[PDB]
Design a binder for this molecule. Structure first.
Ligand code: CU
Ligand code: CU
Ligand code: CU
Length: 439
C-alpha cells in the first residue's frame, strides 16, 4: 500500500454518514507481530469518519466485547443526550448514535469509549478512531494545495499477543507502552510529494505525551482541538497531551530525511524505590526520546505561502459566573479528586445556564500533569500558569502542569447532564471526573 499508513476513510454520502461499527476482539498484524486488539471496524485505529457541517451522522455501535461499552464523541458540541457519558451498551447489544454536525465547526475530532471504570483498558486495547469535519476553508489555495495526512499518535504494550494488562502503578500514572506508533505503524516513512504538508494530529494515547518537533523545521499551528486559529502561529515544538488535537502546516525547506520526534517530556509520572528501608515514590523523570516517523522531502521543495487568515474567533458575551475546580492526587491510593471529591454519577457538581458564558479556573494542585477535558462545551483558553495563550481557537482539553491554573472561557451550549474529567483516562476511571448540568 502507500508508504504512509493512514486509517481508511468513510465519507458522508448525500449529507448522510450512515454506518455500522462493531467493537470486537480482532486478530491483527501490528508493528510486525500478530496480536488481538479491541477495534472498531476491524482496524487499529478505527476508520476515520469524514463529514461536513450540517451532515447527519447515524452510527450504530454493535458491542461484541465481553463488557459494556459506549462512545464519547470527543470534541463535538452536540447534545449530551447523544454524546451520553452515562449510557451503557451491554455485551451483544447495539445502539444508534444520530446527530447533525453543527454548522460552525471544523477540525479533527475522535471517538472512543467513556464507560466510567472501563475506559483505560478499553482505550489502551485499541478502541478509538478519528472524525474529521471538513471546512469551506479547506478550499483556500494555501490549504487545498497542501498534502494532507492524519497522524493518530497512540502507544501500545503487548504481552502474549494481547494488550498488556494494567498494573497498580498504571492506574496511578496512566499506562504508557513501549511501541510508540503512528496510525498503528512503527516509525512509518512519509515520502512527501508536495512541499507543504497539512498534518492533522491526534493524541489518542491513554497517558503518553508527545513533545512534537520536526528536525530542522518549525511547525505552523493552524487548528487546535476544536477549530482553526485566527491565523497561523509559528512554533518550534508542540506538546500534545492525551485527548488533544492540532493541525499544523509543514513547509519543507530542503531535500533530505527529517525525523518527527517526541522529545523528552516529564509529565510527573512516579516510580517506587527502596534505598535502605525506603519504599517511597520517586519521579520517573522525562520520557526517553522517540522517533515517530521519517519525513522524506521531495526534490527542490518550494512550499506554498502560508494563508494570511484562517477563521475569526467569535466574540463571546461577557461571562456571568466564575468557577473553581482544584485537582488533587492520592498517588499511593491511585485516587484522584476534583474539589476533594471523586466522581459520583448521581451527583451534580455544577449547574449552569445554556447560552451564557462561564469562566472556569482549573487549578492543578497535584504533582503530575493533568489534561482537563470538558464534554459538549468547547472553551477558549485565556491563560495557563499565568501566561496568556498566544492564540484564540476552540479547545476541549487543556494541559495543567503541577501548580498551574488555567483560565477558560466556557460558553454553555446544549442543555443536559454531561461531565468533565482528566484525560489521563486512568485518573478518570479512578475518580477524577465531575458532573455538569446545563439548563
Ligand atoms: Cu476523549
Ligand atoms: Cu470524557
Ligand atoms: Cu489526571
Amino acid at each position: 500500500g502507500p508508504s504512509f499508513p493512514e486509517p481508511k476513510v468513510v465519507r458522508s454520502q448525500g449529507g448522510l454518514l450512515s454506518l455500522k461499527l462493531s467493537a470486537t476482539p480482532t486478530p491483527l498484524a501490528i508493528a510486525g507481530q500478530r496480536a488481538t486488539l479491541l477495534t472498531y471496524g476491524g482496524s487499529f485505529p478505527g476508520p476515520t469518519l469524514r463529514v461536513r457541517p450540517r451532515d447527519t451522522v447515524r452510527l450504530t455501535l454493535e458491542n461484541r466485547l465481553p463488557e459494556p461499552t459506549n462512545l464519547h464523541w470527543h470534541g463535538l458540541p452536540i447534545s449530551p443526550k447523544v454524546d451520553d457519558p452515562f449510557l451503557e451498551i451491554p455485551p451483544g447489544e447495539s445502539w444508534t448514535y444520530e446527530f447533525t454536525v453543527p454548522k460552525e465547526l471544523a477540525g479533527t475530532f475522535w471517538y472512543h469509549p467513556h464507560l466510567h471504570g472501563r475506559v483505560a483498558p478499553q482505550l489502551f486495547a485499541g478502541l478509538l478512531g478519528a472524525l474529521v469535519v471538513e471546512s469551506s476553508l479547506d478550499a483556500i489555495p494555501e490549504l487545498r494545495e497542501a498534502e494532507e495526512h492524519l497522524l493518530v499518535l497512540k502507544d501500545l504494550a503487548l504481552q502474549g499477543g494481547r494488550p498488556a494488562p494494567h498494573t497498580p502503578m498504571d492506574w496511578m500514572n496512566g499506562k504508557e507502552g513501549d511501541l510508540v506508533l503512528v496510525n498503528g505503524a512503527l516509525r512509518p516513512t512519509l515520502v512527501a510529494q508536495k512541499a507543504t504538508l497539512r498534518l492533522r494530529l491526534l493524541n489518542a494515547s491513554n497517558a503518553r505525551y508527545y513533545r512534537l518537533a520536526l528536525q530542522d523545521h518549525p511547525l505552523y499551528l493552524i487548528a487546535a482541538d476544536g477549530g482553526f486559529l485566527e491565523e497561523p502561529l509559528e512554533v518550534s515544538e508542540l506538546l500534545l497531551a492525551p485527548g488533544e488535537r492540532a493541525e499544523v502546516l509543514v513547509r519543507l525547506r530542503k531535500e533530505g530525511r527529517f525525523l518527527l520526534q517526541a522529545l523528552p517530556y516529564d509529565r510527573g509520572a512516579m516510580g517506587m524505590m527502596d534505598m535502605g528501608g525506603m519504599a517511597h515514590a520517586m519521579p520517573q523523570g522525562p520520557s526517553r526520546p522517540e522517533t515517530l516517523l521519517y519525513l522524506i522531502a521531495p526534490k527542490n521543495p518550494k512550499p506554498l505561502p502560508l494563508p494570511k487568515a484562517l477563521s475569526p474567533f467569535p466574540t463571546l458575551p461577557a461571562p456571568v459566573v466564575t468557577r473553581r475546580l482544584v485537582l488533587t492526587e492520592d498517588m499511593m491510593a491511585a485516587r484522584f479528586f476534583i474539589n476533594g471529591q471523586v466522581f459520583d454519577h448521581r451527583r451534580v457538581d455544577l449547574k449552569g445556564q445554556a447560552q451564557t458564558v462561564e469562566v472556569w479556573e482549573v487549578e492543578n494542585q497535584g504533582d503530575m500533569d493533568h489534561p482537563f477535558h470538558l464534554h459538549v462545551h468547547p472553551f477558549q483558553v485565556l491563560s495557563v500558569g499565568g501566561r496568556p495563550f498566544p492564540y484564540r481557537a476552540w479547545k476541549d482539553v487543556v494541559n495543567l502542569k503541577a501548580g498551574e491554573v488555567a483560565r477558560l472561557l466556557v460558553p454553555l451550549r446544549e442543555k443536559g447532564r454531561t461531565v468533565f474529567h482528566c484525560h489521563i483516562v486512568e485518573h478518570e476511571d479512578r475518580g477524577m471526573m465531575g458532573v455538569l448540568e446545563v439548563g
